[PDB]
């Protein structure tokens, strides 16, 4: 499985940091989407 | 005189080379064909074997159907007269359906449906041939560079015949299957869209076509100029750099100020060649769908006086 040299243990923290970044990105995206939808909706 | 190494002055012939086999299925392989002395004055005089797999035979069958369909329609246009068929051969055309049919398949066979059938045949043939090139690279363990270089021209072809007609909403936009019919299609395409010269991607495509000619003149002349040091054996000059590679590098280092390597010049070559059809496909795709008058567009974007 470790085709990339990862040892299944630092992949856990790699995924944790990546999900932290992904969720911060999605939180800011949701804030922006809500602000625009209040500004003017599309549905 | 002084020999220039443009023709082989002595030919030598030996055992038929059946090629190597990394993961090749020997069963599909053909047997060596004849030997061409005339063609051997310029290169390898051996012909064959030819590999005929499953995508290969699919491509052969579909291409046979496409070419034969065009031929039968050409005979129909001739009145079945062989003399006319050999007189009006260039002027024949399997035209696409007229615009009032749009993208519909409900066109009469004599009125563009046959063009739809032949286009299906050629589509299948060319895509199976691309799969064929990829698989033949796969069997010998080689890189898939030829497959992607082919995909560039395949994309230009798909834009001309498939993607742009779909976007424009009519098969009438596509190129006919004729000799002068497709020349006329080209000239009329330029005239309708207002001087395709001012298409920036047509200009880029011409830049890379001129660059392909310039680059192959340069590379062929360079390799022939250092063929006296075994410059032809490019792979070994990559693995074990000789005086040929160094002299070729230094010629252009002292001429231009920069140079390639025996391996990276072929990266230059493949990219210079594939950018031709890449930019050409982009430019044809933008024509009509986005810009209908390229000279007015040019005026609005510099490129032309107001």
């Amino acid at each position: 499985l470790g085709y990339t040299g990862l040892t299944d243990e630092q992949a856990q923290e790699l995924h944790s940091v990546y999900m932290s970044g992904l969720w911060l990105f999605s939180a800011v995206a949701i804030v922006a989407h809500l602000a625009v939808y209040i500004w003017r909706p599309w549905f | 005189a002084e020999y220039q190494n443009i023709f082989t002055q002595v030919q030598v012939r030996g055992p038929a080379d059946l090629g190597m086999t990394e993961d090749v299925n020997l069963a599909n392989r053909s047997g060596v064909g004849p030997f061409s002395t005339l063609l051997g004055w310029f290169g390898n005089a051996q012909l064959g074997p030819i590999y005929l797999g499953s995508l290969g035979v699919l491509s052969l069958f579909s291409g046979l159907m496409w070419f034969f369909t065009i031929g039968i329609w050409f005979w129909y246009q001739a009145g079945w007269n062989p003399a006319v068929f050999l007189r009006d051969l260039f002027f024949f055309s399997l035209e696409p359906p007229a615009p009032e049919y749009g993208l519909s398949f409900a066109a009469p066979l004599k009125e563009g449906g046959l063009w739809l059938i032949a286009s299906f045949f050629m589509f299948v043939a060319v895509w199976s041939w691309w799969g064929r090139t990829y698989l033949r690279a796969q069997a010998l363990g080689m890189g898939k560079h030829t497959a992607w270089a082919f995909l560039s021209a395949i994309w230009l072809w798909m834009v001309l015949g498939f993607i742009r007609p779909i976007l424009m909403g009519s098969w009438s936009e596509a190129v006919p299957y004729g000799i002068f019919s497709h020349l006329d299609w080209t000239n009329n395409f330029s005239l309708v869209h207002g001087n395709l010269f001012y298409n920036p991607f047509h200009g880029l495509s011409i830049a890379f076509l001129y660059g392909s000619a310039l680059l192959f003149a340069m590379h062929g002349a360079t390799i022939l100029a250092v063929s006296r040091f075994g410059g032809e054996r490019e792979l070994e000059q990559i693995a074990d750099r000789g005086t040929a590679a160094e002299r070729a590098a230094l010629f252009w280092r002292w001429t231009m100020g920069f140079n390639a390597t025996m391996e990276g010049i072929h990266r230059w070559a493949i990219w210079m060649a594939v950018l031709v059809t890449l930019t050409g496909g982009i430019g044809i795709l933008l024509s009509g769908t986005v810009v209908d008058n390229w000279y007015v567009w040019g005026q609005n974007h510099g490129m032309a006086p107001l």
Partner: protein, 281 residues
């Protein structure tokens, strides 16, 4: 600075003119007698193009143009503002190209290699002279040449191509286009094949000229060989340029009408000229 292997080649000799007066390198560039000549001509041409820009009143790089003299001047001189700057820049460009080719000849001699490169460049130079010297003189006017602008020289191309109908029906044009297109195809195939052999599937051994011969025999049932492919590339490019200069040396000098009518001679062959049926029957 030099490449890691350059020093053993930086030796005197091979210069056609001079021999030690202009036998040195500025950076990577080899400066010779012709290096000096080509630098002078190129610098003059660039400065004069910029000067013609300020005379034209534009600083848009894509709008700068340097037109040749009008048809009224024939094959004579012209004021700098009218067509004289174009004539001087044509002098400078011809000198720069020729000096570049001869400087390449000197570099070839110093490296002990063949002279294929300057010869192949002389082909391009003669195509350029066909467009700016041979065709205008055979026609009698410098105004039949093209302007030195990025998009105005395309205007020259379009107007000339439509002075004779659809230029696609010129047959020398047809063979030149076939050569250009097959040269691009050959370049794509050669680059791809060499890169595929030098770069295997993944983490496995480099391939051999036999392997690439095998690939192209398994693809199209043939291979031209590594010497043959470079021969073919040089031939395709040079012959494309040759038949380009050929299609534009017979156009407006031998044929004057719409080129499409040329293809009438074949359809009016007496045996099948008057058969009913077909496209032209």
């Amino acid at each position: 600075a030099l490449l890691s292997f350059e020093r053993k080649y930086r030796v005197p000799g091979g210069t056609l003119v001079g021999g030690n007066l202009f036998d040195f390198w500025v950076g990577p560039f080899y400066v010779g007698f012709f290096g000096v000549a080509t630098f002078f001509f190129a610098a003059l041409g660039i400065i004069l193009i910029a000067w013609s820009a300020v005379l034209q009143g534009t600083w848009n790089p894509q709008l700068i143009s340097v037109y040749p003299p009008a048809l009224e001047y024939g094959l004579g001189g012209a004021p700098l503002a009218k067509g004289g700057l174009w004539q001087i820049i044509t002098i400078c460009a011809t000198g720069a190209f020729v000096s570049w080719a001869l400087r390449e000849v000197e570099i070839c001699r110093k490296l002990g290699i063949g002279y294929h490169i300057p010869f192949a460049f002389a082909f391009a130079i003669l195509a350029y002279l066909t467009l700016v010297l041979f065709r205008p003189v055979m026609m009698g006017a410098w105004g039949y040449a093209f302007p030195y602008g990025i998009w105005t020289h395309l205007d020259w191309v379009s107007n000339t191509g439509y002075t004779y109908g659809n230029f696609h029906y010129n047959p020398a044009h047809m063979i030149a286009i076939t050569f250009f297109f097959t040269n691009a195809l050959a370049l794509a195939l050669h680059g791809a094949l060499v890169l595929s052999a030098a770069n295997p599937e993944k983490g496995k051994e480099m391939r051999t000229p036999d392997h690439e011969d095998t690939f192209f025999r398994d693809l199209v049932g043939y291979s031209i060989g590594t010497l043959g492919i470079h021969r073919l590339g040089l031939l395709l490019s040079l012959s494309a340029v040759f038949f380009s200069a050929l299609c534009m040396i017979i156009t407006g000098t031998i044929w004057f009408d719409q080129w499409v009518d040329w293809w009438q001679w074949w359809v009016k062959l007496p045996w099948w000229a008057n058969i009913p049926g077909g496209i032209n029957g």
